[PDB]
Amino acid sequence: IETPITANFREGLNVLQYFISTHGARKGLADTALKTANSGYLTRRLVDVA
Amino acid sequence: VPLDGGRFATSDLNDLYRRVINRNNRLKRLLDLAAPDIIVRNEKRMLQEAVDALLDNGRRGRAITGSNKRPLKSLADMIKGKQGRFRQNLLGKRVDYSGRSVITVGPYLRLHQCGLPKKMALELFKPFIYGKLELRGLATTIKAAKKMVEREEAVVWDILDEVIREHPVLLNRAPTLHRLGIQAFEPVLIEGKAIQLHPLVCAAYNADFDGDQMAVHVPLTLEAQLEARALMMSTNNILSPANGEPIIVPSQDVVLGLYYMTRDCVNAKGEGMVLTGPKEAERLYRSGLASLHARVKVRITEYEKDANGELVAKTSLKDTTVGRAILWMIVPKGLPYSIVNQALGKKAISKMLNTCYRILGLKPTVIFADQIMYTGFAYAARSGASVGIDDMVIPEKKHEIISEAEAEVAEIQEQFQSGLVTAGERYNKVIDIWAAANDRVSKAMMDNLQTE
Amino acid sequence: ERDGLFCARIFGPVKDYECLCGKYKRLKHRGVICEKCGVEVTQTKVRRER
Amino acid sequence: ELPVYQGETTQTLQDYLMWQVELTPFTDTDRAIATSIVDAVDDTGYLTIQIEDIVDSIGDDEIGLEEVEAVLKRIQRFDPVGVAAKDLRDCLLIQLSQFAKETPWLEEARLIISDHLDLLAN
Amino acid sequence: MVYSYTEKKRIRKDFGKRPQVLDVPYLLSIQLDSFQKFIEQDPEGQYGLEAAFRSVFPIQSYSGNSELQYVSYRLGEPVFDVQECQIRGVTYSAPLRVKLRLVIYEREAPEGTVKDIKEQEVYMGEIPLMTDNGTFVINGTERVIVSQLHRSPGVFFDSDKGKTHSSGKVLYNARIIPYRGSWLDFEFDPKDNLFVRIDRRRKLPATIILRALNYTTEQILDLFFEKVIFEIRDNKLQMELVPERLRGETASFDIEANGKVYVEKGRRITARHIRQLEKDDVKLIEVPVEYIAGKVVAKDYIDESTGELICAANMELSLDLLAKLSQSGHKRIETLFTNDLDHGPYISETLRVDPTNDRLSALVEIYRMMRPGEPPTREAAESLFENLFFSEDRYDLSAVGRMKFNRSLLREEIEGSGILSKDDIIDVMKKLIDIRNGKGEVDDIDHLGNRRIRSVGEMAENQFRVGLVRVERAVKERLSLGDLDTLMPQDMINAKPISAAVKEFFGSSQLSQFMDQNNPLSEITHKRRISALGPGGLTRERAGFEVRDVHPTHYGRVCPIETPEGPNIGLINSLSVYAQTNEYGFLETPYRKVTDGVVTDEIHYLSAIEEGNYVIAQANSNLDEEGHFVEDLVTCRSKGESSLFSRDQVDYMDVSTQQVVSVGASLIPFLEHDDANRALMGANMQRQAVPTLRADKPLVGTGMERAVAVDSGVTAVAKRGGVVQYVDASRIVIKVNEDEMYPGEAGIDIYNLTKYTRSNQNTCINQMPCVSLGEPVERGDVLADGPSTDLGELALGQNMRVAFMPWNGYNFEDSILVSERVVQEDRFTTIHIQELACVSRDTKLGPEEITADIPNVGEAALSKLDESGIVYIGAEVTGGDILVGKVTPKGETQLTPEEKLLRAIFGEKASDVKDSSLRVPNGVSGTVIDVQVFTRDGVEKDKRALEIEEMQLKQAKKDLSEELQILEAGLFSRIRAVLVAGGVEAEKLDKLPRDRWLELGLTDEEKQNQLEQLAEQYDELKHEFEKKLEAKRRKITQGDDLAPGVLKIVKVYLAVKRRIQPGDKMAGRHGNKGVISKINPIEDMPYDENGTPVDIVLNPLGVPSRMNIGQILETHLGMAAKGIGDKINAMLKQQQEVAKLREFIQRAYDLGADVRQKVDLSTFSDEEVMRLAENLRKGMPIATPVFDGAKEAEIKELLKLGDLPTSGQIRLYDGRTGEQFERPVTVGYMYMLKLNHLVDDKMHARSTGSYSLVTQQPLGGKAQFGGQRFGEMEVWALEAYGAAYTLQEMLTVKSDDVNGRTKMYKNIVDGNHQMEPGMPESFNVLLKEIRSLGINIELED
């Protein structure tokens, strides 16, 4: 997005900035919650092979 | 499978059996009467389909149960898959004890000790209590021992404390993806309903005590105890198997405490004076001198192991603070004094622990890490650790930089609307300008916050 | 029932030392087969093996 | 949610009498006798058959009749005391001998039970 | 002025800079207004039960001329009330009685009616009724149904770009999903083929639907393709040229246009040449013969002289054929453009692939597609193709979907029929071809304007239809057999299918589950949750990465910051504070109409689509008093993006800052000062709280707490109430004013408070009155406070003095240090409530009765039991104690003198009854609060049931007789007033009424008639009272239905108190997620210069990484509010005048900003100020909105006013050494919450127990103690240690090897400590399971 966020948490954030950061937070949470199955499958394969 | 009352439907495993049995009976009955060819062929085809569904269902037909659309499990469905027999049989056996208690933190425990509740340490060690009661003659029979345990007499707790004294117990967190997941410790009789964990070992367990539980297992045979004491203690897994660097490094509190303990502002109280070494701890408590004091000369004796076979002592005058001397008081003789001078950062503590382990051994570096955790939990709590909204300093030039960036973006979009710049650039240039503005703002913030 | 699922004389025995008939019980007969009931007098734990 | 609905193996006053046998110290021969004795125990709590019956069912003429008595004299102080009693009366004798002699009329009650139950029947 | 009574007791200061223009809605209209129209009688058959009745209204027999009509339906009053269904255990529903009309037509006569049977109505099932709060009483439990967010029916053009084909191929497809029926797809192919896919089945030749619809090849070539021009005269090969039709194609040579050449041959085509050719007139121009091979014939032609099969349709032109067709007799041959630069045919290539061309050979393929065998006999294929999605029997597709489909094709007509025609599919395929060639853009699946939400009403109507069609067929199949009969229509109607369907829908469903009772904020959120899993929409949580993601359209429709932390994050959503639902089914959001730069007070609800074409401004913008914008450049959204625009292009503005946040996260103070994910997980953690003994209002809030507590319905709101006359711990009465009640009523309102009732979450609920005596309550005010409520404001947690400092490491990363004063004051102490039920379980061996005379147990355990078998209320029970004495009789015995001895000696035992008592589980210490017992009709075993029966009878009779006494007093006053000036002294009526002496000599003209009328009214009132009492007593002991095999059920409730202890998950509303480690005593805790110690100690290491400056701001604001409260308490204790206190309060309330105007002495009468100040003396409540909270300068000003430091830090001393702490730490109060994760249930311990029948392995749960899951990741760790013996003893002598674990136990008891490997039972089970098949495995040696 062209317009970045220029408001820290000490001076408060506006509505558009928080709404935009909500997307990145949701993406990060989904990635951290869905990478565990891939890590477990990789460990399963590495143990079963060696 | 009695579900509710006289429910003897025997579903998902015997329905196919009775179906095949009745199909075979009807086929035999029809063959005994010389039935027509088409009818017996259809009956044999139905029997073949039933046998195929019984041996391995899901490949053809997908025979469902009359109850709901739930596909019943055949003789092969209970073998393969995540719900198969090879999951429970192979590395799926449940244990009796299994722990399952809430884990907490404890600052008074040792690296090779763990706190277990008295109620949990009584149900698990029940056969041991029965054996001790039968040996000491307090319980003439097994029934008497059970009755004494169920009543929780006074001598029962003393016998439990006598028995659980030297019996190791291996505790592990449920999510484990390495070797340091399972480690053994020594039980400690503590009240409450929470298993106390050592603060330094948390890095190995990757726990923050935000609500996670802990599993506990008690070995029985002597060889299991030997394997837990000589191969599964925290005092043996100090280094990481994946790297070799010390994984027992302290947490945020101890590092912050050790960092704040060795500082000096400009010329704080107790500056410029000369004194002894370990004696400097008296001026701290007696308010005669602050722990932060530069240009302070102290007498430091260094036991260097440069000579092959034995170490030699060296006495000289050094320039240091009071906190560094107080830290050196607990520092072993083998380690030099130049290691506690560089403000003792996070990387510095790990390097010091590694050098101590590689030069002086395992027990010395373990005791030194324990003393480090102690003095950290003490000084971080006592001296300077705090937080406030006034601590966040905002640079004054931030508004000017934002206004300049906005003016630059306005000029860029004006040039774009004029027809000299395309959309592709009218975008990349704005991104670059905002990145430069953010970098500038970060610099101006670090200029006013760091060493200002 | 007779000659069915969970039946006697097949698929395993019944209560350790008591025939389904009611004769040759009380550990007085180890491995005999009665004429009224063809149920062995073995332990019930062997029912998971036949 | 597999083959077995849940599946649970209830204990019962037969398995509970067997549990105790293991813990207690007997020899290899005394162990067999005891196994045989507890087989004879019923839901009510009484050795079903007889004393000499167990001796005759063990097929070995050697083993004395007191041999079983010796074992059977210790199995009936197990969990519920008075288990495996001998004809709804030795129960009282075993149950009474158990608690202390400081009870008020233990003498009297012992004397009653010993030979004077027929009279109490009326 | 607030002009409120419940608010004047404690006024919360607000800092909202922007005024509110729209009040907070009921917040429960999504569940209340949806079920209303489904049960409300509507005149027109639009929706509800009328739409379901009219859908299957025509019921005609098979050539029988019989029809069944209806007039209307009606619902009767429920048998039981709302509380009676929860006590007994029956569902709360109303019977559906509908009138019918059976009119049979006389055969052999056109429309001959002989008689009608429209004189008896029929009952069709019991329909559940929703309460006023939005829950049901299904099976005596409170259940909630969640609305389903699913893609709206219609046509959607998907992109399908990426690795779908691994070649950079964007296969554009078109799918249509009706509400009911079969689906239809138009998936693409890398070979440029529009393969058809019906119900995700096998592929299709892509043109079967075209040939099955009577469309021939020539019709397809004429419709989907256009023939521009073709002419041949004396082998000239002259054809017209249109520049607009075809252009941009390079020509080889021979390019002349009637003499002068416009486009030079052999050169690249340019726009100038096209313009010059279009400017001049164009005629038939000659073309080379090489272009004939490239063209394709569209329509087949034949010679007029010979009817040969030459010149087939859809075939490339051949040279040898050409020389023949030129003399065949056809001068004009239809051709195609085939300009691949702009137009892609994609049809002519697919026509030759189809092996079938006839209509019959095409309609048999669709039947062979669905059926593998059974070839159609010229009647099965056509019937299957017509009944699939053309018969309207099962193709009614939610005509809202028809409107959505017409909107996609730019059709102006939105009203149409459910079934579509050939033109619809033709237009869909044409639009797909245009999108493939390039036109417009594809649709968005994640767009809210493309997906709808089905509430409880739509699902209930769907269910009811599915249950009623079963009846249609039934009645239809019954009217065919035995038509010559004059019986009533009762035999044909059978409500069993309808009842079974509605039961299966309401009782147990995937989207209908129990609701949490604790922290009624959770109740409100659950009543507003929206799920995706279930029938339709998404199948599992792992459907896709982009589906469960935040969308820009989620601005004012759903709540993005509120989502479960579980693996199903993104699928569960929460409605906003101002979100609504369209009549079609989509979502809406309100905006303020802005015209010519000024803002109008009118509001308009725009949907997701309507909000995309207009410009909408933001709420946090400057605005003048007259409505003009202060700054010319305003930030606003034009199309999905926020940019700067002028004050004229703006069309709408937001309503408030609370529009983009739901009520679950809006209560979070300083939401903008916290991290996105932190506040996200904190909003969810808010719903996991538990009430305590005393509720304490938050010193800092948002103001929405009042509305939440009001709309939650857990409190006791007042309706049409006036002056209060009597209050009690469980009963309140209110006397309504004379100008409010309607005539013919006494004018009293009763309120029964819920006292210690078991909740669905094993917790307690309780209500207490807020008024004392003689206080007037207006309409809409609160009367009592339920759980976690204080003075009408939601009070979940408590305000505790917090600090941010390490203390000997007892405040680690996520641990919290708690003082001892917290335990002494019983803070955060909760009460749990459990229930134990026992049934008689009648069997073959006679019945079972409770007599409290069970043998094998002394009088010690029976001392707490009553003469019937239950224990007395109030008695304490610790561990396994006998609560209900139940016996099970055994089979009879013979004479058996041996056993008859003990039978006659010991009384009446004789092995007749067992000891099957209640026998509660292992050690639990608690008390009994109340019991419950049910008994079927026809049983007189009520030994003590009459006690609770008489108690309920007296409880009802009290409130019944209150109104009777009020009416009798009114009638007596009327009698005393009618005898005035009639010659009656005051001493006569005072001593005894005596029926006014029967009006002996009062007036002798009208007094007699007055006395007669008064006596008649008194007799009528007495009769009504007697009838009401009789009906109430009959309804109380009417009886409850029980299980067939169960004779009577007895339930006993237990209540336990649980306090704080190490291991409790205490966390605030900012994401603290901390636990308890150790309780520090009083003197050990640090203190200030005044000697006041802190109660809560946190970790200061959390704030830097976990960005939660909001919690620190809340702490500073709470410190300021407590400073103000301490000053007020000092001014109250030092006994100052009322004027000084009033001045101080007005000054503290009127400074900070221009947010509002509030001044005392205007409404208060110098007496309300004292009671108002006596409530906020422990702290001053402060309200801060979501995105318009208070600034740091205001906090500093309030701190300076409350005689507190500006920064917030203060010097503290050590409670162990007494030394001053350098670097002063911030001090202040904070609102802490207690979660439901105590160690009282998480703790588990077992050494031995019961094992399963298969493989002899323990269980996994807590009840019936079982071991935990020893996964592969634990043993794999042990392999890296080399502990072979440890793994062996862990896997052999702990779970399997029944003899091995017994030998291990024996050796541990004896002290041998020896083990054996034996053999695992699971391995033998696996061998036995494998040997069942044709696999031979054995153990050799």
Residue numbers in the entry:
A (entry chain D): 755 to 804
B (entry chain D): 253 to 704
C (entry chain D): 52 to 101
D (entry chain M): 108 to 229
E (entry chain C): 1 to 1341
Quote the authors verbatim:
In bacteria, RNAP relies on dissociable sigma factors (σ) to recognize specific promoters and are thus the primary transcription factors. In contrast, σ54 recognizes conserved promoter sequences at −24 and −12 (13–16) and forms stable RPcs that are then fully dependent on specialized activator proteins for transcription. The activation of RPc requires activators that bind to DNA remotely upstream (−100 to −150 bp) of RPc and use adenosine triphosphate (ATP) hydrolysis to remodel RPc. σ54 controls a diverse range of stress response genes, forms a major variant sigma class of its own, and has wide importance for various bacteria. In this study, using both fully duplexed DNA and −12/−11 mismatch DNA, we formed transcription complexes, using the AAA+ domain of phage shock protein F (PspF1–275), an exemplar bEBP shown to be active in vitro without its cognate DNA binding domain, ATP hydrolysis transition state analog ADP.AlFx, the RNAP, σ54, and a native fully duplexed nifH promoter DNA between −35 and +28.
